């Protein structure tokens, strides 16, 4: 399945539609590369193929 | 590092104004220039920004065709072309070296400006 | 539009004097908002990012929060350096472009 969501997970009890800070996060989180990172710590590009 | 570029005097509206923040002191494959003008008093207004890779460029939503960023490899610089200026936006023009690379819509959400280079004295009138 | 900011928040010194930034539903709230710092007639620096640290050369007395609708922004004690501009920046879905503050200046008395 394919999602795109930009609107705000909540992750506690009051309704986080569009606030966002005290108690839910945004759920898309960049990744870190860097390339003095280590080798486990490098983007790797994969295909797939079925 | 230092983001210098040339300095244009005052002149008749209907023209078309020329600087070029260079980009020196770095390697220029992965940062990002974000251009904004800063008005006397009033708040900022923010253009977009280039891509070195590519003329991948995003423009705001009040400006489209009056403002164009292209870019160049062997000179480094980047050359801008404001046709139809207008005597209401006299404001200096500031170039940033921003990290962070993106060519999408839905990036600009962990990136900032780090180095404001000195701004070029730009204004409107005969 | 543009966000809403005080004119002059100004405070005496010897005490704390806090400055707010209020913008809208989708302006702050779901981004994270981003403090910079200006020289009086000078090009401008990044003075928060992220709402939870500082970089190298950046006094550590200085903070600021955020709450879910606003930013606030804690400093304590003016000296003759202290009077320069302090400007609020966001970012949204909507505009899809940066609005910046609306500029406040801070005077001793």
């Known amino acids: 399945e394919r999602d795109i969501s930009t609107e705000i997970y909540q992750a506690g009890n009051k309704p986080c539609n569009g606030v966002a800070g005290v108690n839910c996060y945004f759920p898309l989180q960049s990744y870190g590369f860097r390339p003095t990172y280590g080798v486990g710590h490098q983007p790797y590009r994969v295909v797939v193929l079925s | 590092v230092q983001l210098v570029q040339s300095g244009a005097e005052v002149k008749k509206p209907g023209a078309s104004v020329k600087v070029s923040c260079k980009a020196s002191?770095?390697?220029?494959?992965?940062?990002?220039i974000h251009w904004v003008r800063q008005a006397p008093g009033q708040g900022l207004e923010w253009m977009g920004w280039?891509?070195?890779?590519?003329?991948?460029?995003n423009y705001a939503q009040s400006f489209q065709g009056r403002v164009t960023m292209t870019r160049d490899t062997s000179i480094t610089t980047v050359y801008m072309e404001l046709s139809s200026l207008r005597s209401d936006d006299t404001a200096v023009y500031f170039c940033?070296?921003?990290?962070?690379?993106?060519?999408?819509?839905?990036?600009?959400?962990?990136?900032?400006?780090?180095?404001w280079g000195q701004g070029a004295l730009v204004t409107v009138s005969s | 539009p543009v966000l809403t900011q005080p004119p002059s928040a100004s405070g005496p010194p010897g005490q704390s004097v806090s400055i707010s930034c209020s913008g809208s539903?989708?302006?702050?709230?779901?981004?994270?908002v981003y403090w910079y710092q200006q020289l009086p007639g000078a090009a401008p620096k990044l003075l928060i990012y992220?709402?939870?640290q500082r970089p190298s050369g950046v006094p550590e007395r200085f903070f600021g929060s955020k709450s879910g609708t606003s930013a606030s922004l804690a400093i304590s004690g003016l000296r003759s350096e202290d009077e320069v501009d302090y400007y609020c920046?966001?970012?949204?879905?909507?505009?899809?472009?940066?609005?910046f503050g609306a500029g406040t200046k801070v005077t001793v008395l």
């Open positions: 940033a070296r921003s990290v962070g690379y993106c060519s999408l819509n839905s990036c600009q959400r962990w990136m900032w400006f780090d180095t």
């Open positions: 002191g770095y390697i220029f494959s992965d940062y990002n």
């Open positions: 280039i891509s070195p890779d590519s003329d991948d460029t």
């Open positions: 539903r989708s302006n702050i709230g779901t981004n994270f």
């Open positions: 992220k709402n939870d």
């Open positions: 920046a966001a970012w949204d879905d909507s505009l899809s472009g940066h609005v």
